[PDB]
């Protein structure tokens, strides 16, 4: 795998979004991994719909939280997911309003990275494209992150509670990192991104619940 990769450079990542007060980070992480594959498979970059997932993944809990593997299973079983324009984000749970006419992507299933394997996570981002990841984002240092390579020893790999997307990895000033896209708006972190330490004992549990969709 290459020493570093940055999908933002390849045009594989859509602009950073803002989930608002809904616990829909899982839907944004899932659509980001799907938009990454959609760009690789069609050459077009376009926003997928987080709202479609929030109201349609009955296996999940709306604004009450959920998992990306559950979202990829819904897209596969449903034979599609709508584009954000066809199904706009409103930030609150509503009845399922999926419309096949607005279908913008399909999924044929998914794959999860070996648990805690930072090496296998690296091989996947490099081989597949952006990958959905779960992290413990409960620390004040994470919430107020601004720059550099994030690392807080108090982060708990066993307390996963937020979903984000790995769009690459590299090194900055000698510190290996994962390039993470959040869905807290462009004003959060560095233009809505955070570089998280890579190979530092799976900091924040970044390789514990990683997955990507098959397309």
* Residues tagged active-site: 25, 162, 182
Within positions 68 to 127, which residues make up the interface with Ca ion, using CB under 5 A?
A: 70
Comparing C-alpha atoms, which of 11, 10, 8, 28 is closest to residue 19?
28
User: Taking contact as CB under 5 A, which single stretch among the options 26-34, 49-57, 67-75, 89-97 is the one that binds Ca ion?
Assistant: 67-75
We find the least distance from the C-beta atom of residue 78 to Ca ion, in angstroms, to be: 14
**Nearer Cβ to Ca ion (33/155):** 33
Within positions 15 to 44, which residues make up the interface with Ca ion, using CB under 5 A?
A: none
We find the least distance from the C-beta atom of residue 200 to Ca ion, in angstroms, to be: 30
Euclidean distance between CA atoms 87 and 85, whole angstroms: 5
Counting contacts by CB under 5 A, is residue 65 touching Ca ion? no
**Nearer Cβ to Ca ion (70/117):** 70
The count of C-alpha atoms lying within 13 angstroms of the C-alpha of 70, restricted to the half-sphere facing its C-beta, is 17
Q: Which residues of 104-132 are buried (b: 16+ CB within 10 A; e: fewer)?
A: bbbbeebebbeebebeebbebbbebbbbb
Residue closest to Ca ion (Cβ): 70
Phi-psi region of 205 (alpha: psi -120 to 50; beta: other; left: phi over 0): left
Count of chain residues binding Ca ion (CB under 5 A)? 1
We find the least distance from the C-beta atom of residue 208 to Ca ion, in angstroms, to be: 17
Euclidean distance between CA atoms 83 and 178, whole angstroms: 27
Q: Residue with structure tokens 């790999």?
A: 157
**Nearer Cβ to Ca ion (3/59):** 59
| Residue 193 structure tokens | 């991104």
> What's 70-106 look like in SS3?
HHHHHHHHHCCEEECCCCCCCCCCCCCCCCHHHEEEC
We find the least distance from the C-beta atom of residue 96 to Ca ion, in angstroms, to be: 17
User: Taking contact as CB under 5 A, which single stretch among the options 63-71, 111-119, 138-146, 161-169 is the one that binds Ca ion?
Assistant: 63-71
User: Taking contact as CB under 5 A, which single stretch among the options 64-72, 105-113, 116-124, 127-135 is the one that binds Ca ion?
Assistant: 64-72
Residues near Ca ion (CB under 5 A) are: 70
């Amino acid at each position: 795998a290459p020493d570093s990769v940055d999908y933002r450079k390849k045009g594989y990542v859509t602009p950073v979004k803002n989930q608002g007060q809904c616990g829909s980070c899982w839907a944004f992480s899932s659509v980001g991994a799907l938009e990454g594959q959609l760009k690789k498979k069609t050459g077009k970059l376009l926003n997928l719909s987080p709202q479609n997932l929030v109201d349609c993944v009955s296996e999940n809990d709306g604004c009450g939280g959920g998992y990306m593997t559950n979202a990829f299973q819904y897209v596969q079983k449903n034979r599609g997911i709508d584009s954000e324009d066809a199904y706009p984000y409103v930030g609150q749970e509503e009845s399922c309003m999926y419309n096949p006419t607005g279908k913008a992507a399909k999924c044929r299933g998914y794959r999860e990275i070996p648990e805690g394997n930072e090496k296998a996570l690296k091989r996947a981002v490099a081989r597949v494209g952006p990958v959905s990841v779960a992290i413990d984002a409960s620390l004040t240092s994470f919430q107020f992150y601004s720059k550099g390579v994030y690392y807080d020893e108090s982060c708990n790999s066993d307390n996963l509670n937020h979903a984000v997307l790995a769009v690459g990895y590299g090194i900055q000033k000698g510190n290996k990192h994962w390039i993470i896209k959040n869905s807290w708006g462009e004003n959060w972190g560095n233009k809505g991104y955070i570089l998280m330490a890579r190979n530092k004992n799976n900091a924040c549990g970044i390789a514990n619940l990683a997955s990507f969709p098959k397309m």
